[PDB]
Write a protein that binds this ligand. Structure first.
Ligand SMILES: Nc1ncnc2c1ncn2[C@@H]1O[C@H](COP(=O)(O)OP(=O)(O)OC[C@H]2O[C@H](O)[C@H](O)[C@@H]2O)[C@@H](O)[C@H]1O
Ligand SMILES: Nc1ncnc2c1ncn2[C@@H]1O[C@H](COP(=O)(O)OP(=O)(O)OC[C@H]2O[C@H](O)[C@H](O)[C@@H]2O)[C@@H](O)[C@H]1O
Ligand SMILES: Nc1ncnc2c1ncn2[C@@H]1O[C@H](COP(=O)(O)OP(=O)(O)OC[C@H]2O[C@H](O)[C@H](O)[C@@H]2O)[C@@H](O)[C@H]1O
Lengths: 399, 400, 390
């Protein structure tokens, strides 16, 4: 269930290790798309089912004329969405050069439908997306505990925690604004909010309140748009819903560059994108510094970039990592049978190393977001220890 | 029924935490109108009960014509005094603007008939208000104990304790004058006492090194303060105050003309002649924005907007600890579970559900009274070997 | 006329004195409603005249039945509307509580008309109010200079400049945003903004870039109190889509205790708390040592600001500079028997025998624009265009 360096580890020692791992100089987390399942989110598996059910006509064309997907994989619902986008874009680009009008519309329809399906699963509240004070609900009660535990475990003279994510939903912002705390994401201004890369080096100070954190979104957001003027703007949720989200969801018009996101395999296709590179540079720079700990939850290991970056970080004798993977036993069994997908071989390789700096936690339902939040400890405000634990010695001498 | 951070803890851990808190850089306390119940005071509910009995026709007119209070709200004892006073003042002002005649005098009578109950309930002793040695009785023992416990625990090179209150009575001055302690109030002189804001930074000093003193802040004025036409604040003794201007209030009727400085109102910013009220709150705000600070609250009912806001906004510091006493706690949770309850019943339950270790809430009914509050305070240890007795700790207890 | 406590000095002495004042520890700038006329602002006189000439049918009722407008002041255009709105709201609340059905609908018309007249003179851009980068226009040019130089004067290790304004229009925010400088106004968040008073003591510092404070005395067009008992804030576009557009382009509709401008709802603690906070912060700043305050665009028509300014003059290190143009006319009016209490208060400061007060009067001598270019002084476009060519 719990492995450290290829061996087996118990529970009490695991808790003691986790407690000691939160006292280092740098602590950070990385949250995937499975972390927001309890708040009302979806998963890429359900997107395929929704697309298949809602659009029964385009699937036939895709499987018949263009041979972009196999029949058995479609029936089993085990197809990769992040890969079909690249093939569809390549097909669209090839046809547009030779002036073939019939194929362009048929591929634009597929792209518009798939993008419409993707965006709808990030609202988390349906039509209630345009209301206010959504952070007071009971669903967003564990994010608040996570933030409180991450920030309360700090000593004066240390650095602030950092949070990395690969989602689009506005759960972290709502949870943080509920408690009245401020997060920094490189934006500033109210009426005209822009992106300034140098706003990541600013911290609070008392002239005569010391509670803040950073937040990096590695794949954009649902409220960021570009006007092609080499600038990026951010607006509120109700403003965005009134502007373009409602039209995209309901009017079923053709998709354009209303909002910038990165669904796909090759992230370098967007040449004029200068945000993605900046965020990944900050991630890589944060990793390299010594005396660092990192907790990973909700990640499916389906990205070449991230799991290629992680592997090279273990040559530093000051980097510790904790990885949660629910369905570990199935992957272990299936790799020995001949092999499986590329996502599972990576996690199997990590488990089998011989360094005492990698820990993998499995166990199905007990390696979820709630359990991960529960494992984090509370600080001890006031540290005799010479007789305090010796009082119970009299009690246990009463056999 | 003791909670911190949403969890629960026992008595021994609570007492150890209380002992730990008392030896910080700064220590303070905040009292309310519930702490004077044991000394002979009364709450606003008794004030309303007396008013409804003593003025039948005024209540009837209010119910029938002016419609300020509904028939169902009054009988079940759920009315409010601050909002009623504010609404009556607004109605009087609009009546004056409309140049009315009967409404003006009727609302003047209504307003003048209300301050009498407050002044009557603020005496704590009755006819013996203008007498000497009032602190020698047995009704002020616990206040003396609290003052002694607060003063004794301090170490050389630290800051003097501070006390805040929202009362009109003199339960603290009588107790402090019996022991010989010299409180600093913000006044000077004997034959003419004036409010100088610059005296809040003065400390005693002996040429050969009495050493015991403390500060007192009254947030809502006092019963012994009157403002002259020269925009000055003067303080007198109890005997002179009783003799000159407060005797006529009880015996006679309709003779209230800004005689004493009190704020029974929900909002005080509309009143634009009071600057001491803004003076005390600056010190209160400055006190709770310093590192290594602790604060105890007892007798407060969370009925003030400004205090609630300033307390809530002060929890963002990482070196602030607070203890709150609130006797009827289970009922508030039960009423909130249905989504209802008053705003006061919601402010307390919101605080209890925080995820920080820097907040503590105590309930239990009769276990969270003023008498029990003083008992939890620890006596200092003088000479401490304390390292060899811990060896004997196991030996001493050998029953079986 | 340019007099310094009753004496006269050349321009060089004035420049040296203002330079010495600008080299103090604490500085502050106070602006009134007269500062907005440089880009499309309006004064009380013009709006009152327009209301008189547009709705004369209900002015007689306001005088005969309610007794709200002084006839002599109305003819002389010497009436305050800010107090009138507050008393109208009080009257409406009293009528609603008393359950007077006939009288309840009467005050809706006057309140709607007053709010329609008020909001027409605060957009400053008309129908283009909901666009972006509106601070880039040439109209908001001297505001950039004022803010930039005020920030530039401050030396390292000292405090930050403060700005007090009575206008309730989005004027300084555009200039601050387009300049590239952050300002703190006691609000935080993006999706749901709330008012936290304790934000006026924060600062920035690079771990390996300054700011300024703004105090809106009477609120703004964006601050509004929703159904919940909390104070919020919205952007210009959202407010325009929500309520600003309707009240200007609708027949008759009134919500009630919803909006928090201009200094209107002071009878509610939830709404009066912010006003009290601004008053307290102003008073606290005024009563600090070695402070210099610059006044401009204020008509001295308030019974509260004048007295609190007068009381603070006890300290020998509190300098006040006033910019009131019509000084010689004031002297001529004072010469005869007739006079006004406001102008008597204004001319009282000229009876001082110490070199701290300096009153500037005349024509262009004391204007909000001219006041801007009195403080001392402290490409990319070509490259941007070259890049934009592709
Ligand atoms: N309740 C739960 N709590 C935690 N983890 C869970 C839970 N339920 C399932 N899981 C695990 O959550 C995981 C679900 O994996 P998926 O979200 O499809 O893969 P990814 O995270 O790489 O996709 C993120 C995409 O978002 C970007 O836009 C890019 O397109 C990324 O590819 C499995 O391990 C489940 O067992
Ligand atoms: N024996 C007791 N010992 C301690 N506390 C007690 C006791 N009995 C009751 N309490 C608590 O004492 C508290 C007071 O009951 P509340 O009805 O809020 O008092 P008020 O209405 O007279 O005015 C209270 C303040 O609110 C106003 O705005 C003014 O600022 C007043 O100062 C409750 O928690 C009681 O349970
Ligand atoms: N270009 C100009 N240059 C100089 N002064 C000017 C200019 N244009 C106008 N003025 C002067 O600007 C002045 C405008 O005076 P008022 O608008 O009454 O002052 P406030 O609103 O700031 O005062 C606030 C109070 O007003 C409310 O009623 C409440 O009582 C508020 O508390 C006149 O003297 C003009 O000559």
């Amino acid at each position: 269930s719990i492995y450290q360096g290829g061996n087996k580890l118990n529970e009490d020692d695991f808790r003691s290790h986790v407690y000691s791992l939160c006292q280092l100089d740098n602590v950070g987390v990385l949250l995937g798309a499975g972390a927001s399942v309890g708040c009302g989110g979806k998963t890429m598996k359900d997107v395929w089912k929704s697309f298949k059910q809602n659009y029964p006509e385009l699937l036939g064309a895709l499987i018949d004329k263009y041979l972009l997907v196999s029949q058995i994989d479609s029936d089993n619902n085990l197809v990769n969405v992040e890969l079909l986008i690249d093939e569809a874009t390549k097909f669209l680009s090839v046809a547009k050069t030779r002036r073939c009008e019939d194929e362009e519309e048929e591929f634009r329809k597929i792209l518009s439908s798939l993008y419409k399906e993707v965006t709808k699963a990030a609202l988390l509240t349906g039509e209630q997306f345009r209301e206010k004070n959504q952070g007071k609900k009971d669903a967003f009660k564990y994010h608040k505990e996570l933030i409180s535990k991450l920030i309360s475990n700090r000593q004066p003279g240390q650095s602030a925690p950092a949070i990395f994510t690969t989602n689009y939903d506005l759960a972290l912002e709502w949870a943080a604004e509920d408690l009245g705390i401020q997060l920094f994401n490189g934006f500033s201004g109210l009426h005209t909010r822009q992106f300034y890369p140098q706003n990541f080096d600013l911290a609070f100070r008392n002239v005569n309140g010391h509670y803040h954190a950073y937040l990096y979104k590695l794949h954009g957001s649902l409220t960021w748009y570009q006007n092609d003027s080499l600038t990026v703007n951010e607006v509120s949720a109700s403003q965005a819903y009134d502007e373009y989200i409602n039209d995209i969801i309901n009017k079923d018009d053709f998709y354009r560059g209303q909002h910038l996101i990165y669904p796909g395999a090759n992230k370098y296709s967007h040449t004029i994108g200068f945000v993605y590179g900046e965020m990944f540079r900050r991630f890589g720079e944060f990793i390299s510094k010594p005396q660092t700990a990192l907790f990973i939850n909700g990640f499916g290991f389906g990205d070449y970039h991230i799991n290629r970056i992680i592997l090279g970080a273990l040559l530093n004798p000051s980097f510790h990592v904790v990885i949660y993977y629910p369905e570990l036993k199935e992957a272990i069994t299936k790799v020995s049978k001949g092999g499986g997908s590329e996502a599972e071989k990576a996690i199997v390789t990590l488990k089998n190393m011989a360094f005492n700096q990698v820990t993998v936690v499995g166990g199905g339902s007990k390696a979820y977001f709630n359990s991960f939040v529960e494992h984090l400890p509370y600080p001890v405000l006031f540290p005799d220890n010479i007789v305090d634990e010796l009082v119970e010695a009299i009690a246990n001498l009463s056999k």
